[PDB]
Amino acid sequence: RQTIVQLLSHMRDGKEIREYLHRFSGIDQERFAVIKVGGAVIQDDLPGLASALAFLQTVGLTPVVVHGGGPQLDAALEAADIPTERVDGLRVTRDEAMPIIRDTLTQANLALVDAIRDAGGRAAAVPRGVFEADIVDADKLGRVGEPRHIHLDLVGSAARAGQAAILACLGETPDGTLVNINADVAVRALVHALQPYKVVFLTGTGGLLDEDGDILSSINLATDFGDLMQADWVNGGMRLKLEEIKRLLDDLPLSSSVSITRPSELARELFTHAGSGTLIRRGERMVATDDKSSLDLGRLDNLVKAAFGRPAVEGYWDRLRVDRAFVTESYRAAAITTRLDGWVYLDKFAVLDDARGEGLGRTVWNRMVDYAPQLIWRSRTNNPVNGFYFEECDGAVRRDEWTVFWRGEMGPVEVADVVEKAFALPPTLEA
Amino acid sequence: RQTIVQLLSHMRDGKEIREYLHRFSGIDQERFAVIKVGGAVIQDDLPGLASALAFLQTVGLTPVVVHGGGPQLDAALEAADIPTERVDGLRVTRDEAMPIIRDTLTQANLALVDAIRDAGGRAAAVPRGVFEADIVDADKLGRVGEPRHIHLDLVGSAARAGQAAILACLGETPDGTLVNINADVAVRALVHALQPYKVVFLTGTGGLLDEDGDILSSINLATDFGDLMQADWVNGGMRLKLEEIKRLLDDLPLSSSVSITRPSELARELFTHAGSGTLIRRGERMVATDDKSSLDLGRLDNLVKAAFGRPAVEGYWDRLRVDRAFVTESYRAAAITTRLDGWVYLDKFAVLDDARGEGLGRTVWNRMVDYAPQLIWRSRTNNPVNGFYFEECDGAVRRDEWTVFWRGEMGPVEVADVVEKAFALPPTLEA
Amino acid sequence: RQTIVQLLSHMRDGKEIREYLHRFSGIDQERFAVIKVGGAVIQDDLPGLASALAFLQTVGLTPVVVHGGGPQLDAALEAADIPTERVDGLRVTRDEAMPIIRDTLTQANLALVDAIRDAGGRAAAVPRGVFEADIVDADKLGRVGEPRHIHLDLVGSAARAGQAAILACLGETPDGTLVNINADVAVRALVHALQPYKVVFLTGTGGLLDEDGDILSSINLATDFGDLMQADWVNGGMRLKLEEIKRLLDDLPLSSSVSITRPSELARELFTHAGSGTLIRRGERMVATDDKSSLDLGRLDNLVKAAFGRPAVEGYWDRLRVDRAFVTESYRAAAITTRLDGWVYLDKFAVLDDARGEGLGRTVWNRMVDYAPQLIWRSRTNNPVNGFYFEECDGAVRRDEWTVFWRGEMGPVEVADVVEKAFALPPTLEA
Amino acid sequence: RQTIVQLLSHMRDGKEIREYLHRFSGIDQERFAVIKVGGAVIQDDLPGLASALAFLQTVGLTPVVVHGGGPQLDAALEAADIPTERVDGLRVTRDEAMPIIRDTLTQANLALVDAIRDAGGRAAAVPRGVFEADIVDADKLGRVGEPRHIHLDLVGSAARAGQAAILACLGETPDGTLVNINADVAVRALVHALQPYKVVFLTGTGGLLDEDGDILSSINLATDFGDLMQADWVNGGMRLKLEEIKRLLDDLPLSSSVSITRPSELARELFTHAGSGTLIRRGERMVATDDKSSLDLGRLDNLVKAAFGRPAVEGYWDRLRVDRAFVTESYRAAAITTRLDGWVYLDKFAVLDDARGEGLGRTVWNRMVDYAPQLIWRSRTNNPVNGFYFEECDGAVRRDEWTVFWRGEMGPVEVADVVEKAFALPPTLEA
Ligand SMILES: NC(=[NH2+])NCCC[C@H](N)C(=O)O
Ligand SMILES: NC(=[NH2+])NCCC[C@H](N)C(=O)O
Ligand SMILES: NC(=[NH2+])NCCC[C@H](N)C(=O)O
Ligand SMILES: NC(=[NH2+])NCCC[C@H](N)C(=O)O
């Protein structure tokens, strides 16, 4: 950590790393992150899981880990004594099953603690003592319980000691009787009590998938929630997650987020803007209008001045046409279309880096290219957004100063004429 | 850890300290020590007790600690709760006074862990989940259990990371129920489980007390147990600690000793032969004989050679008188008396380094001066044994090469006679 | 050290980074690198220079650094000293101005050592005692020396301690006399002695410049040396650096490369294929042929298979057209152009990982596009070479599975035809 | 070191270690200690030397070590080139001899550095660059030099880094010429420039010897110098040390000291009052008077009160006889004799702990036993001074509360009467 005092200047993307670090170091205690890792992960990828969690804990951060026991107990060691795996409301365990669950959750818990230590970091075994539960479901569900309180003494002790606290889903009733707590109801209680700035689900998949097969980078629940639930291509398992994640995020401050990655990406996910998994925030709504009057042109001047680093030319704003503008509620990202020969033309796309990390730039760019299937725009040849534009474009012409892109399905010869006019437009920002 | 291999060879004793460091660095995990510590010490001397256990840790050792709830739940947190301290069997807990118990011992437990971390050491909170217990008492005692099995899972994980396992006296049952376990029976089944090299009692009292209020340095149960049980000065409570202490040591190897101290004296107690408290071993028998033919002169000569670093002069043995010889069953410590102008004289006091530390040098010495109230003996002025002789003498005369000691108050005018005769005597050893 | 093996495998590239780590950890001692850093660099950017070298140290590498004293002694401490900057042979120092040099470079030396230590890294001041030198100039220059022997005493011990050996350009003679050594001959004699895997030049300029002022990424002396010296755009001073760079590389193994950078890009330059500066290797020869029979279709069949991860389809080679083939002497990098409607088309561009990193892919590509100013080609949409193709193309069209590029500014209406033929084309590779 | 935040409470002598630690930690820079170790030590005992030095440097301390190369150069690598080892004034080195001394002191320097680092600590090789010397002794002495200036640039760097700086006796003239510096003249030169709190000589023997063969613990130059020089049992070699040592301390503040131990003793030496070798201070003069008026009875009451923790009984002073009083100039240690049945009797012996650490208690006690060959005194049986008394006694009788000692050659029958009177003296102090 002292040997990471100025080990913050050189990695393959080194400057926004600093800022993500100096933000998770707003510790309070263990209010940094509640990381839920499934039973499947500790079995099929324990080293990678460990290195990833242990990496954090050397750079100062101390997550609170909750692990399940899916494959471990719900199979490998509870089909063994031919007990068989009945699943009622969401999980039944008769009194006979209890001592096996006890011994196999504790075994995974310690398996992980040691893995973290052996990987360079520090962990703290907390199988029990956190979850105080009620039992009301006796003949209904058996010995499964619902959290009434969270003792955070053991967890706090761990943070002060610089140790990732490792929780196992074992609970205790008021009068000390043991109980099996389901891993989801457990995470919820903990996220509630701790109010973490970050909730991470480490899965083997590495994030929710979109209609095309790709990983869904950002989800902005304010605009995207309805669209997803309603969709035909979203399978039952994705909707329960989203509905759950949203239930979690509605119980946290706006600054809290959820990430869904695989252990290997976890650092990429937490320490760069672009991320490396699925980010899900409550997010913010957007205005789609063609009435320039309504927009706060001052805040836009600011947005452009910050995003591009240079200001818009004198009297660019009141002289501007506007075919449609898309601006996020906070004026931290915006897309502004004009018209060029009757073609929709993207005149400004401005997104502050911190807005880019929350997925707002994509929230804006998607509503924009949804209105404009056939889109033409340009970008300086040095612009770092060029890689993003090129993944989104369908064609491009490249000169020594500007590069014109286009979207839609038009044979190159069709857009050859509008392209030349875009190269000959005056600069709307100096330098 | 590694930054410790030197700290020590320069100490006030730094020669036999090397000896103890290696002896104790036969880890086998947590088989180094079991350290019972009453509730009274954690309350009244948390900082020093924490520094003690920290010290052990920095030097590379990892003890298993067990704390009780004397001046805590059996006072403080149930004297202002109106349950009234129920004492029947030896420690009764109703169901009502059970969730009181859980959190009283749990608070103590973390206080200890942080205090140890505060003082520079590594420790690990293991509040519950070790003692698997049978609830045999029903209504007569309440919610008290007796360890049928010991889950050393959590203990092991601590050790590997080099941590002191701070256990609490809370237990499970076959079917979950949180149950109270009294400290001593906990320590018994735990010592039986771990087979530690060293059982340590930390009390404020600082040791065990002898007839005249001094600290009883050592007890050798082979020879001393019967004596200590039938002496009237030994109070009924000391006749209890001793019996129970016997039960533990009868369940350990002969190499395993029990020590009783206070936190500030623990290091001196562990890392010196001299000790600093009350060592109690199973030890070994001793013969007291006047017939020389009934001894093993071969083993004695080995002993003399090994102990003094020089061998006995020619024919010393065939020529040796022998008023009374006191040799311990293993010939690792022996005292042999002759006669001198009628007075009893000590010709040989031979103890091997290791034997001195098991209190065998003392055992033999104590039996000899019980036979020889009036005793004369001598010692080269560089015998490091001089300090102990001095502490045992009633007088001394000093010349350059030898020093004559005597003992048993006998009017220093008639001792001028026997002192001179003692200086005159031919050597019986060379160099 | 141990707390480092993971930091990186999660990076934006974290896969080719493992390789160079493995490569740079063929220790021997200080044979990883020799890093010359000019005087102007320690004065104007001391912190950045130190974070760069500190980073290396944390990663487990220990470069041998050699610093000069441009804007220090050859200015600062002798422009208000009246000795007047004598420059004749190439670096003159009289007898009087020798103790000025001594305390100037050493001050510089410790400014560097402490700065490195401040940024978290380990370093060792070696102001003198490495360079045993011959006073070859007499009265013509004064007290300037030529390295006869390199004493690696201090350097080896630095390395062993995980330290950057910070050498200064001061040397002895056979009989003691302290003598001045100019930085370049020092680096030459040092590289010859150390035979490092890597020679690195740190300047503020950040690399070497091409015809149009951009940074020249790679130089392959085999093909490029003659071309560059007879180039009129390569200035007389740049023609000197290259000459000396050859001389260093001709005395090193073929695996020993040279980099020229600025401190901020040092990590990227060393741990990625793409680099971030100017690489210079001895490299290898390249054939350019239009005759298919002058090629080894077996060896190309391997190259292609290894580059794409898939094998060329059956009979592809016997059937292959071939306008021009560009294959490097070791068959690790090749481009094969065919014909398509009169246009030159690139059927295969195959570069192996190591070859990409030695700048051989660049070598082939550049020789290919100098023969084919007007070029058409395609690439699957998930080819990571796409980014590079994009930086080189003048246009591109994108469908789901493939993407067509073209090159050489030629009015996007006449290329609409040959693009279709390119998408139409049957694959020549499978999976 | 953080793991020595509270690792300062338990060792075989735990309370005065802290105080020495918090005193050497007044560093300024490298002003703590200049440690001279002869060539003989690095040859015949390098591991022990290193651990001894590595311990300092891990507890915060940064000594500056100067080593010679006695056995190394005066043999190991310089009888080899048949040069013969001539010693004029005190050391001659012809021009031919220079390059061997260089390579063999340097080889010794790194041998020491690597040894320390392998032993846990941190060091900084400074074979050359510290001693700037003059040569005026050309054909007389050859290439030997006497320090004219001390560059501490390298030494301060080592201190800041927490590195024991390891200096070799190699010098440099104004014009860079190499030179052989004698190890004694260098230490003289270095102590002058650094003004250390401590000057330590690490030798194989382990401290100066007294007339009896034992190690001489204290020398109080104000009182002991003249007495030693003059003595018959002090050989010429002991005289040259004493002359040199005095020459050093006379160039340091009164607070400086010299210790002469062996590496194995060095910690005991610096961190306890008793030490473990020979300590030498400029010290302070003494009053031996029989006029009670002249003594400052105010300052004496304070002394007794501090040294004993209890005050002298009401009217002990004005009723007190005083046969002779021995008081150190600062009233920090004192011996007061009265008369008892015509025998000299030591009524008070009082020494503040810190004065016992500067050797004043022994200075006071030495003039005392010189005045009183036949001395009787007493001391409580629990007094830690008893072991010192017993080493100094000629006889002693012991009861359960007090113990009477005596000096001189008197058969028990001669002192049996007075001893009884010493047992019956009133306590002249309360509690
Ligand atoms: N899938 C993503 N785009 N994630 C972006 C993550 C942004 C930010 N570093 C965070 O951890 O919250
Ligand atoms: N009370 C005593 N004198 N104990 C001696 C202790 C010797 C050794 N350190 C041990 O723990 O067994
Ligand atoms: N200027 C460049 N393209 N350099 C490439 C660097 C490749 C490799 N990492 C090396 O250091 O040799
Ligand atoms: N030979 C002695 N008695 N030395 C005493 C040393 C006292 C003190 N610890 C010091 O280092 O200065």
Side-chain angles (χ1 to χ4, degrees), chain D residues 68-359:
Chain D
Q72 283 77 16
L73 51 74
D74 186 31
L77 283 176
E78 217 175 11
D81 249 315
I82 334 183
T84 66
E85 308 89 28
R86 194 75 166 80
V87 241
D88 277 348
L90 281 185
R91 241 243 134 289
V92 284
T93 68
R94 285 315 191 276
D95 307 76
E96 30 195 358
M98 264 293 92
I100 325 287
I101 287 165
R102 172 181 68 201
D103 290 333
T104 227
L105 288 182
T106 301
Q107 178 184 134
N109 195 264
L110 294 155
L112 181 50
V113 170
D114 287 275
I116 287 170
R117 295 178 166 155
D118 290 328
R122 293 162 53 97
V126 199
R128 49 169 65 259
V130 150
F131 298 107
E132 188 175 10
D134 292 332
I135 191 53
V136 184
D137 35 71
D139 41 322
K140 186 180 175 84
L141 265 278
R143 196 94 86 87
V144 183
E146 175 95 3
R148 197 211 57 79
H149 199 245
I150 306 291
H151 304 320
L152 292 171
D153 303 274
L154 287 161
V155 178
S157 191
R160 287 191 287 290
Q163 298 179 337
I166 311 307
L167 278 62
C169 295
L170 296 178
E172 170 203 15
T173 77
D175 40 75
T177 307
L178 208 76
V179 110
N180 179 227
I181 287 190
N182 188 254
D184 288 332
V185 304
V187 164
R188 218 199 319 266
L190 200 51
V191 166
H192 183 48
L194 272 179
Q195 298 273 308
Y197 182 78
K198 217 77 180 65
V199 185
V200 186
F201 297 91
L202 299 177
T203 60
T205 67
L208 273 27
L209 297 178
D210 68 352
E211 175 168 31
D212 293 315
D214 301 325
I215 294 183
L216 206 55
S217 172
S218 326
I219 290 180
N220 182 328
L221 293 186
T223 68
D224 307 330
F225 183 62
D227 298 333
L228 289 160
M229 299 296 275
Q230 165 157 5
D232 294 318
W233 61 269
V234 176
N235 50 277
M238 183 163 177
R239 254 122 61 179
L240 291 172
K241 292 176 195 162
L242 294 170
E243 208 191 358
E244 181 71 12
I245 299 210
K246 179 201 196 296
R247 187 173 322 274
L248 290 180
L249 294 166
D250 282 14
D251 191 30
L252 305 170
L254 266 187
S255 51
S256 305
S257 31
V258 170
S259 298
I260 298 178
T261 42
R262 66 172 75 96
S264 12
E265 311 301 343
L266 188 60
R268 247 180 181 166
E269 174 62 20
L270 296 166
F271 294 98
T272 68
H273 288 311
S276 185
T278 296
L279 175 109
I280 313 176
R281 297 179 151 267
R282 261 165 33 175
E284 45 187 82
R285 307 206 218 82
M286 196 201 313
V287 297
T289 198
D290 64 339
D291 181 24
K292 173 174 29 181
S293 82
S294 48
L295 305 180
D296 198 331
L297 296 191
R299 295 179 71 179
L300 282 185
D301 198 39
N302 276 12
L303 169 52
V304 170
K305 185 203 305 174
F308 290 92
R310 331 181 310 270
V313 293
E314 179 178 1
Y316 157 75
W317 292 111
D318 77 319
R319 191 191 1 179
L320 168 75
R321 294 312 273 186
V322 179
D323 162 90
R324 195 158 191 83
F326 307 102
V327 188
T328 193
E329 208 175 23
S330 61
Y331 284 66
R332 273 187 301 153
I336 296 176
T337 68
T338 58
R339 283 269 166 175
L340 182 62
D341 206 69
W343 296 96
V344 185
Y345 173 83
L346 187 73
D347 196 35
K348 288 318 134 206
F349 185 50
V351 186
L352 307 177
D353 289 332
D354 21 314
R356 185 168 59 85
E358 315 182 351

Side-chain angles (χ1 to χ4, degrees), chain A residues 102 114 122 128 172, chain B residues 102 117 122 128 160 172:
Chain A
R102 174 182 70 204
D114 285 276
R122 297 163 56 97
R128 48 170 66 225
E172 168 201 13
Chain B
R102 164 187 63 200
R117 277 158 190 175
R122 288 179 55 62
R128 39 172 163 204
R160 279 184 283 279
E172 285 216 340

Side-chain angles (χ1 to χ4, degrees), chain C residues 20 24 198 217-218 257 259 269-279 357:
Chain C
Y20 289 120
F24 295 145
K198 199 76 198 167
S217 182
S218 316
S257 47
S259 296
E269 171 65 24
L270 300 174
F271 298 86
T272 78
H273 291 322
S276 201
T278 306
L279 180 68

